[PDB]
């Protein structure tokens, strides 16, 4: 079915909590920077989409704050998988935040989906790539509603 099931939702929150640091950005920053490094090394023109947050300088305070915002947004969505009504509202707000930006398409999300599939097993224990991607795609489906292919 490839649907993000209730079982897959529990597994993703387990894969996420066993890596998430609730008190210090050291682990969040590391995962995020590693994801965008993987994204930039696979999609070279994507770095120009983050000119405002110093995308070329991954260790700048400006891109550190952006990385923290991206992981915070993913963390809120993973938690809201248990409450899909509120999740649908949050994924719409994220969609308009990624709208009206030429270069931000559905192809970049499929690329960052691969980035997470390569970063997560290096840092997460008991990682389930099947269950992870089924719900990650469920999350990105709401983030890419009004975007180009």
């Amino acid at each position: 079915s490839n649907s993000c099931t209730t079982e897959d939702r529990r597994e993703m929150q387990l894969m996420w909590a066993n890596v998430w640091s609730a008190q210090f950005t050291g682990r969040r920053l590391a995962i995020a920077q590693a994801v965008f490094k993987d994204l930039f090394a696979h999609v070279p023109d994507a770095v120009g989409l983050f000119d405002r947050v110093h995308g070329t300088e991954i260790d700048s305070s400006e891109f550190k704050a952006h990385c923290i915002r991206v992981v915070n947004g993913l963390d809120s969505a993973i938690g809201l998988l248990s409450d899909p009504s509120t999740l649908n509202e949050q994924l719409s707000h994220l969609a308009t935040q990624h709208q009206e930006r030429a270069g931000v398409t559905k192809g970049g999300f499929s690329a960052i989906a691969q980035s997470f599939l390569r970063v997560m097993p290096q840092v997460a224990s008991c990682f389930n790539p099947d269950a992870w991607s089924r719900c990650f795609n469920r999350i990105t489906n709401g983030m890419t509603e009004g975007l180009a292919e």
Partner: protein, 144 residues
């Protein structure tokens, strides 16, 4: 009281307990904003787009989700002065054209403190550390 290195560590751990993993976050956020609009019902008007009239709607619950996420980012950055100021400036721009008074920032401040205390218990709540470090956060969101 001052938001020193020790108070930042205590606030971090106490926030992580109250904020939790995700199960109690809906109740946590509801408790906060029910306190806000009770102490200041006039603040509801600024939340027209996110259903400030009805904090039970999925629209407002997502807004409360974003507000708590913003606090979580700030609390997680209290030990990183450089990055914390950057994220606080990002929050400042998100509230720049909204005319948020200094009285209101303290109202939400008090609701957040009552919510954390309600979540972790008055027996362990560190009021001085929480008051001093939330001042540092709100003062950065107001520019200064």
């Amino acid at each position: 009281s001052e938001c020193g290195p020790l108070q930042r560590l205590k606030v971090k751990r106490q926030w992580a307990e109250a904020y939790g993993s995700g199960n109690g976050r809906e109740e946590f956020g509801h408790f906060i904003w029910a306190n806000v609009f009770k102490v200041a019902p006039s603040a509801r008007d600024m939340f027209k787009r996110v259903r400030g009239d009805n904090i039970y709607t999925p629209a407002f619950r997502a807004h409360a989700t974003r507000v708590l996420g913003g606090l979580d980012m700030c609390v997680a950055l209290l030990d990183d002065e450089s990055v914390l100021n950057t994220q606080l400036a990002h929050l400042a721009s998100q509230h720049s054209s909204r005319g948020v008074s200094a009285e209101q920032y303290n109202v939400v401040e008090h609701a957040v403190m009552m919510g954390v205390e309600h979540e972790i218990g008055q027996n362990v709540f560190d009021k001085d550390a929480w008051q001093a470090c939330l001042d540092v956060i709100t003062s950065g969101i107001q520019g200064n």
